[PDB]
């Protein structure tokens, strides 16, 4: 089914932009959305008003927790607000910043800040939701639990852009973090998946991403776990795992140093 | 395959992979700056094991410190320059704080990320700024630079009890890809190795590290290698498995759920 009535969702970075569009999309399917962003971003917008408007349009409600997602206290507060509303069913890790800089000019703070919000912020909420879902599965008749996890990576994690080493490293770690979550929680009914979105009728409208997140948050995605998606425009692309390009097996027990040098140097001879 | 007169820096070289890596570089004539934590350097004989490698005419220096701290990456770069320059950087230092994801503490996550990911960044960025400055002053506009960073297949698989390890190693791969793009124009080569830790002897990795640190690897940049005994596997970039394009200029949320639910119903 596509309906999300009586289900509690948590969305980070939901004050504006894509996180706001996702939070509106969930509350509009009946989900009770716990929106998170920095107190400053929540005050400058009215997402908590545009939601609970749309959420109580469909019977649900909407609380707004403020805080830095890189801080443990914020992830603890998000889990607390959800449990107080009935439980936790859907989590959409979306909050993120950028500190673009050529690698040889990138400072420690520019690296640390992006890693904290993206990678550590994803971990804190993913770990908390994993602990809750695992425990609720222990107390559930059937040893299972409904759980949906949607982490937001990026195509930068695959290409490693110039001037975005921090952003690319965090986004690649988020994928690896989510693959562990899917492998650890899949046997109890939790689905953890990754989206690599591009967002600005408009071919870059966030609604292109929202419709995919709505699926990844619905029970209809029960057989979707540990998958990575690229979505922008009217297309959704399923990324395959990395494959091997060439195997360099030695004609013995161990590679000889010069023997290996000759093989690799020749393979990369006509290399662009 | 001859590193005479060059200066290399290897982290986590008290034992295991880093020691074997730093030993293989010193045998090829490379001056090696050995880095690990004081306690690991003390319990190890790697200072004199590599110091006695002058038999290929080069010396070895030890620099203790936590690689996850900026001061350590600063002292490592200062030591190499004091020895005449910086040609080879092998980022290898790392720890494991294994734990199921639903039981993993903040410290267990922060610690693995700091040593692996931040330590790689600090020394990679220091080497990047040095190689970029050295290249602008070079009359040919280039510099000899070799960056060997250590990831793991865990970053591709996402093991159940190593979410911190997998995420750090995955970010290290992306960090090295950015380093390769940013520095390849200056004659620097930045590549990744994915070891498996006798097929699991550390000397199976040394042969590749010796290549990736040599001028012979001048046409190898931004590549990821998996090493497992006598096998060296070159990883290809991830490709797309299937694209789902909507009829028209917008997905109906229901035709999308139907398209994805049917595709995943019968797919092992």
Output phi, psi for A5, to 5 deg.
-65, 145
- Tell me the C-alpha to C-alpha distance, in Å, between residue A56 and each of A10, A62, A90, B152: 16, 8, 18, 48
Lookup result for tokens 């319990």: B43
Q: What is the Cα–Cα distance from B130 to B208, expressed in whole angstroms? A: 25
Lookup result for tokens 């399923």: A238
Beta strand A190-197 with A32-37: parallel, antiparallel or unpaired?
unpaired
Lookup result for tokens 């005449």: B84
Lookup result for tokens 């040394």: B206
Please report which residue ranges of A139-256 form alpha helices under DSSP H: 156-159, 165-185, 207-216
Output phi, psi for A93, to 5 deg.
-75, 115
- Given A132, A153, A171, A218, the catalytic residue: A171
Lookup result for tokens 């920095």: A38
Q: What is the Cα–Cα distance from A131 to B107, expressed in whole angstroms? A: 16
Question: E strands along chain B, which residues?
Answer: 7-11, 31-36, 60-64, 88-91, 145-150, 188-195, 224-228, 231-235, 240-245
Query: A169–B166: do the CB atoms touch at under 8 Å?
Result: no
Burial of A2 (0-12, 13-18, 19+ CB in 10 A): middle
Query: B243–A236: do the CB atoms touch at under 8 Å?
Result: yes
- Residues of A with CB below 8 A from B265's CB? 223
DSSP string, A46-95: -HHHHTTTHHHHTT--EEEEES-TTSHHHHHHHHHHHHHTT---EEEE--
Other C-beta atoms lying within 10 Å of the C-beta of residue B69: 15
Q: What is the Cα–Cα distance from B205 to A270, expressed in whole angstroms? A: 25
Q: Which two tokens stand for residue A114?
A: 């992006």
Q: What is the Cα–Cα distance from B237 to B223, expressed in whole angstroms? A: 9
Residue B225 contacts by C-beta under 8 Å, 6 or more apart in sequence? B191, B192, B193, B194, B208, B212, B232, B233, B234, B235
If we measure between CA atoms, which residue out of B90, B91, B94, B109 comes closest to residue B6? B90
Q: What is the Cα–Cα distance from A20 to A35, expressed in whole angstroms? A: 8
- Tell me the C-alpha to C-alpha distance, in Å, between residue A63 and each of A27, A44, A56, A82, A186: 11, 16, 12, 9, 29
Q: What is the Cα–Cα distance from A214 to B257, expressed in whole angstroms? A: 9
Q: What is the Cα–Cα distance from A4 to B142, expressed in whole angstroms? A: 59
Say if residues A108 and B114 touch (Cβ distance below 8 Å).
no
Lookup result for tokens 């290929």: B56
- Given B68, B79, B151, B152, the catalytic residue: B152
Q: At what angle do helices A207-216 and B253-265 cross, to 10 degrees?
A: 50
Q: Which two tokens stand for residue B177?
A: 């890809």
Residues counted in chain A: 272
3-state secondary structure A105-126: HCCHHHHHHHHHHHHHHHHHHH
Q: Quote the distance between the C-alpha of residue A132 and its chain's center.
A: 18
Residues followed by a gap in chain B, C→N > 2.5 Å:
55, 197
Cβ–Cβ contact B104 with A under 8 A = yes
Q: What is the Cα–Cα distance from B148 to B191, expressed in whole angstroms? A: 5
Output phi, psi for B193, to 5 deg.
-120, 140
Radius of gyration of chain B (CA): 21
Domains of chain B, residue spans = 1-268
Q: Which two tokens stand for residue A66?
A: 């403020």
Residues followed by a gap in chain A, C→N > 2.5 Å:
200
**From A123, which residue of chain B is nearest by alpha-carbon distance?**
B109
Q: What is the Cα–Cα distance from A192 to B142, expressed in whole angstroms? A: 45
Burial of A97 (0-12, 13-18, 19+ CB in 10 A): middle
As beta bridge partners, residue B7 has B31
- Given B169, B178, B207, B236, the catalytic residue: B169
Chain B, window 20-79: residues with a beta carbon less than 8 angstroms from a chain A beta carbon? 70
Is residue A188 part of the annotated active site? The answer reads no
């Amino acid at each position: 089914t596509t309906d999300l009535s009586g289900k509690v969702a948590v969305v980070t970075g939901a004050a504006a932009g894509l996180g706001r569009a996702e939070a509106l999309g969930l509350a509009r399917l009946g989900a009770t959305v716990v929106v998170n962003d920095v107190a400053s971003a929540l005050d400058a917008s009215d997402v908590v008003d545009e939601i609970g408007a749309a959420a109580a349009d469909a019977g649900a409600k909407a609380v707004a927790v403020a805080g830095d997602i890189s801080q443990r206290a914020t992830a603890d507060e998000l889990l607390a607000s959800a449990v107080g509303l009935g439980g936790l069913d859907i989590v959409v890790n979306n909050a993120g910043i950028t500190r673009d800089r050529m690698l040889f000019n990138m400072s420690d703070e520019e690296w640390d800040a992006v890693i904290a919000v993206h990678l550590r912020g994803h971990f804190l909420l993913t770990r908390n939701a994993a602990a809750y879902w695992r425990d609720k599965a222990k107390d559930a008749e059937g040893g299972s639990v409904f759980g949906r996890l949607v982490n937001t990576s990026s195509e930068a994690g695959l290409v490693g852009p110039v001037g975005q080493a921090n952003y690319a490293a965090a986004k690649a770690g988020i994928t690896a973090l989510t693959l562990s979550a899917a492998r650890a929680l899949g046997r109890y009914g939790v689905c953890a998946n990754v989206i690599c979105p591009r967002a600005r009728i408009d071919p870059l409208s966030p609604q292109h991403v929202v419709s995919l997140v709505q699926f990844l948050a619905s029970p209809a995605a029960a057989e979707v776990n540990g998958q990575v998606f690229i979505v922008y425009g009217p297309q959704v692309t399923l990324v395959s795992p990395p494959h091997m390009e060439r195997r360099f097996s030695a004609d013995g027990t161990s590679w000889d140093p010069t023997e290996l040098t000759a093989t690799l140097r020749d393979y990369f001879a006509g290399r662009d």
